[PDB]
């Protein structure tokens, strides 16, 4: 299930961009691709906000695993997302709803398939910014996490508020792949809110407040 890492590199700086729980969150690396991302959102948003452009990128078919353009309901801007699943709506037949994963951020929302657009191919150039992680060295106190544990983890990381943190990789878990192929590895990291005083260890705060062990 889970392996230790005797050869961690130097720690790096990241923003926590989305959280599901301490066992499953997404970071973006601090650096020049963030501003490239910013530029990309603005561009996609100016572009897909015109009808003419939506109609030249109307989806006649949509598939699970497909990368598309999608509005995020909380700000009305356009993002690159991957269709994770499609589910029916029994009260409206004109509307299947797609579970989409916002690839540069890591959150997932249900969007009506009607409002997705084909993603113009040049918009794939920039690397997908969201890296899945989990927090090393903690487990929930008897994703099996208590909701307020998750909540507090969102406060400590200041999820989605562009607060830079220091990340050290300590463990990992292997992810399965096509047979014979190399396995992927999700990193188990520790996060620190570094300052002149010293460091806030986010997981150590969770353990002390009784949310984790
Ligand atoms: C966290 N996931 C995002 N997109 C998929 N975020 C995009 C930016 C959200 C915007 N700042 C806002 O206030 O809504």
Curated annotation (Swiss-Prot):
The stretch of residues making up the signal peptide is none
Record's subcellular location: Mitochondrion outer membrane
- Tudor domain location, by residue? 61-126
Per the record, the domain of life is Eukaryota
Record's subunit section: Interacts with (symmetrically methylated) Siwi. Interacts with (symmetrically methylated) Ago3. Interacts with PNLDC1/trimmer; interaction takes place on the mitochondrial surface and recruits PNLDC1/trimmer to Siwi-bound pre-piRNAs.
Q: Which family does it belong to?
A: Belongs to the Tdrkh family.
Summarizing the function annotation, the protein's role is: Participates in the primary piRNA biogenesis pathway and is required during spermatogenesis to repress transposable elements and prevent their mobilization, which is essential for the germline integrity. The piRNA metabolic process mediates the repression of transposable elements during meiosis by forming complexes composed of piRNAs and Piwi proteins (Siwi or Ago3) and govern the methylation and subsequent repression of transposons.
Domain observations = The Tudor domain specifically recognizes and binds symmetrically methylated Siwi and Ago3.
Name-wise, this protein is Tudor and KH domain-containing protein homolog
Which organism does this record belong to?
Bombyx mori
Taxonomic lineage of the native organism: Eukaryota, Metazoa, Ecdysozoa, Arthropoda, Hexapoda
């Amino acid at each position: 299930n889970l392996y230790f890492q005797s050869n961690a590199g130097p720690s790096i700086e990241v923003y926590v961009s989305a959280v599901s729980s301490p066992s499953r969150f997404w970071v973006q690396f601090v650096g020049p691709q963030v501003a490239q991302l910013d530029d990309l959102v603005a561009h996609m948003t100016e572009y897909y906000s015109k009808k003419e452009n939506r109609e030249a990128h109307t989806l006649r078919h949509v598939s699970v695993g497909q990368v598309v353009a999608a509005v995020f309901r909380h700000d009305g801007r356009w993002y690159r997302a991957r269709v994770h699943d499609i589910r029916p709506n029994e009260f409206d037949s004109s509307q299947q709803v797609a579970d989409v994963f916002y690839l540069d951020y890591g959150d997932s929302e249900y969007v009506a398939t009607h409002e997705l657009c084909e993603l113009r191919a040049d918009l794939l150039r920039l690397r997908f910014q969201a890296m899945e992680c989990f927090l090393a060295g903690v487990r929930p106190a008897s994703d099996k996490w208590h909701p307020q544990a998750v909540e507090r983890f969102e406060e400590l990381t200041q999820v989605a508020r562009w607060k830079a943190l220091v990340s050290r990789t300590c463990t990992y878990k292997k992810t399965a792949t096509a047979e014979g192929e190399k396995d992927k590895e999700i990193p188990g990291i520790k996060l620190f809110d570094v300052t002149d005083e010293g460091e806030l260890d986010v997981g150590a705060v969770l353990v002390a407040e009784g949310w984790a062990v």
